[PDB]
Amino acid sequence: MRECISIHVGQAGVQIGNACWELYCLEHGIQPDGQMPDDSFNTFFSETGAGKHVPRAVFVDLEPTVIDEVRTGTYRQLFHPEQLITGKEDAANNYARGHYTIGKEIIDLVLDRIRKLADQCTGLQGFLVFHSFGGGTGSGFTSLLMERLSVDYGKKSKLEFSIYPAPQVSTAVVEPYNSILTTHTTLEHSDCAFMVDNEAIYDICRRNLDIERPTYTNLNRLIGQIVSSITASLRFDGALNVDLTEFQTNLVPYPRIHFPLATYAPVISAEKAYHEQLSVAEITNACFEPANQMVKCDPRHGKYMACCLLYRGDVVPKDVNAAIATIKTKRTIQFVDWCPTGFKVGINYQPPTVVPGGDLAKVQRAVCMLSNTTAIAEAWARLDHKFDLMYAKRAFVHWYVGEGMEEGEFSEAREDMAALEKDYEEVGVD
């Protein structure tokens, strides 16, 4: 029961998923053969006759390279050759290819593995879509698939893990186009989306894992840690609390207003030694420093429409309440009038498991604070500006147009953003 399928959309999407799935195998002491030496983890994996626990997931990419790395990699047997879908012709960092031209030549096959994974689902909760914002595949293909599941699986829970572009971490001049194009098309077909601004991920490694030049892994190993903290409340039935979907109810006030901000803590490198350790009250306040945020924004200026604390490890209400007590005096946590000033707190048993030969050190007590602040519309503002600049001159546009796309789709997709931008304005009115 309570099943959920994870769908990975090229490069960012695939690579992230691997960091996730490797951590999952560790979390539930699973070996890279599907075998393992609570039953709540069966919401993500599935046991066969031989006792093989295959994940309820799909790895998709328009070109082979990234998925081939999985097909030969350290976990080659952890999946099905069918559940690992690939093309040949890449999305050429173009949404118009990802969505239309190239995308159409796989979608049907893709949706089928989803349907075959959907069959073994006693009671499907929904889907988790790990994609890039600026990648041709991550953008175009994702929206096509998201539109198609809103058809096939109708009003079913479509959750996302979007990878917000950062110049520091790769990028490609067009990315903001692909970003705004997908943001728009996905909006109606999404339920709740978790953005991950690659700069804030970069910044963190640099500052805490003390990595001057963060590798993709270095970032993903960290990202997977934050994502797992979100999905902890699903693969674990810990009496303590652990309760996603309940969070989502406070988190999503209105439907377009579905972008919670993640503020993971504590990110500590395996080097500290006699630092042991942070109190609940320390890590609580950690979530309030914009330096720990998943997306770079400022909610000290920003209003609030939800605050949700997801604890994991050595947590006792006594001090969480004592923690929430102090914070509730810090006159920067200003909520809207129509919104209550409460904090939905969930606690897990299983503390954060750390990757063998990793950058981070085994924390006793980890947290992740999801919140619905109007300060997120800064990410949109950041992206919309770069879009405007190139669009002004209709720079690179011809590549999109050349793949079918009407010149109006870009404007439509921009006004929709402008609306969402204004929607966060309106909601913040007291």
Partner: protein, 428 residues
């Protein structure tokens, strides 16, 4: 004879606490066998328990949930073995703190199936009194399905009496933003469908645990320990033989003066701590005035803000009706402004010469006070915050509903407060 349904996370945990406290009072050991000393227990044991002949006992309890979780807690629980297996009626798709899920879409799918158990369990009885529903007012299974089940039952057994142990929500206990929506929607259904409703404010239970019981971290076990006391406390008259000699309908006739004004303010004296320490007993005057004072109410209102229409009080433990009656006449004479002069002898006492578990005296209270409108304004206000801006409505409109149901459900509760008022001001 009586049928006891328990709906939702709250209602089931609440219900299993009553079913364990009353089974200690009746000598029904976790397994299902009478072992009690006096057969004074056995006399009115047919009200709640059946016979496996046996001669095992089964509670007249139907269990409802739209997800397994809590059913299993009872199964795994000590007194869980005592329950009829064919009585656990539960879904898999949790209703998730949505009154519209429990009341419409999800609930409907399990209702008919549950109703069959009540149809069956109602057959076993020579002449049933009515029904008892224990549930949360801010959830979805309890809040929505419970009210659905009530409407369904009312239709099936119109002549039978609808009694509920309805737990009022609060922001002090539960962070679920949506709660004033479910609460209002469910209040609206009670105002029109139940005959007597026991108003259990979580605000007040958390406040009791905190200020009064000195419990720094109030857990549900502590908040629920207070409820089981007030349940076995008000159901002393149904389970225990004495000069009363009463039923659900006799209570309803005497307590409820006007139809809609049927929400009750439970009270208890002494407010004991879950565990420690039981030392030092109470005097009669101590036990009376405590019980009448706002600090001892399971509902968060001020009796001194309204005027009681009718009052009921079950004093337990070995004492003297002289002492007791001497204090009741003292109170009504002292606090004469807060008892409606136009309902002669508006306060009823009851003395049972059996104390509850541990404590060697008790004094359970029920008051049909106009002051309860405070508990309703509390909710109606919390509702509007969200409502004026139509916040969190999408979850409900998605379920099939319309804003009209919210407009109506509030307007109906605003008319109740408007009504509770009419009488608070009225004089001969």
């Amino acid at each position: 004879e009586i049928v006891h349904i328990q709906a939702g996370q709250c209602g089931n945990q609440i219900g299993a606490k009553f079913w364990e406290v009353i089974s200690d009072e009746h000598g029904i050991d976790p397994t299902g066998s009478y072992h009690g000393d006096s057969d004074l227990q056995l006399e009115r044991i047919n009200v709640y328990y059946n016979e496996a002949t046996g001669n095992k006992y089964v509670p007249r309890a139907i269990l409802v949930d739209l997800e397994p979780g809590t059913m299993d807690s009872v199964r795994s629980g000590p007194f869980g073995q005592i329950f009829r297996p064919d009585n656990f009626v539960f879904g898999q798709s949790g209703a998730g703190n949505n009154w519209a899920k429990g009341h419409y879409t999800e609930g409907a799918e399990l209702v008919d199936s549950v109703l069959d158990v009540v149809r069956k369990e109602s057959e076993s009885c020579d002449c049933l009194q009515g029904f008892q529903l224990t549930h949360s007012l801010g959830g979805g299974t309890g809040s929505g399905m419970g009210t659905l089940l009530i409407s369904k039952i009312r239709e099936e057994y119109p002549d039978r009496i609808m009694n509920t142990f309805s737990v009022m929500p609060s922001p002090k206990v539960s962070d679920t933003v949506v709660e004033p929506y479910n609460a209002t929607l469910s209040v609206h259904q009670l105002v029109e469908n139940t005959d007597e409703t026991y108003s259990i404010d979580n605000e007040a239970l958390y406040d009791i645990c905190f200020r009064t019981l000195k419990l720094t971290t109030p857990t549900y076990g502590d908040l629920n320990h207070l409820v089981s006391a007030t349940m076995s406390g008000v159901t002393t008259c149904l389970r225990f033989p004495g000069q009363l000699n009463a039923d659900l309908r006799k209570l309803a006739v005497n307590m409820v003066p006007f139809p809609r004004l049927h929400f009750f303010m439970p009270g208890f004296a002494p407010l004991t701590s879950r565990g420690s320490q039981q030392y030092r007993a109470l005097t009669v005057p101590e036990l009376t005035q405590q019980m009448f004072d706002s600090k001892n109410m399971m509902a968060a209102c001020d009796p001194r803000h309204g005027r009681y229409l009718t009052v009921a009080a079950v004093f337990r433990g070995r004492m003297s009706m002289k002492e007791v009656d001497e204090q009741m006449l003292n109170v009504q004479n002292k606090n004469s402004s807060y008892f409606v002069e136009w309902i002669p002898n508006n306060v009823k006492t009851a003395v049972c010469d059996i104390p509850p578990r541990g404590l060697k005296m008790s004094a359970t209270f029920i008051g049909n006070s106009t002051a309860i409108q405070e508990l309703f304004k509390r909710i109606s206000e919390q509702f509007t915050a969200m409502f004026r801006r139509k916040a969190f409505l999408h979850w409900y409109t998605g379920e099939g509903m319309d804003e009209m149901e919210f407009t109506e459900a509030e307007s109906n509760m605003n008319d109740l407060v408007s009504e509770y008022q009419q009488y608070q001001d009225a004089t001969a």
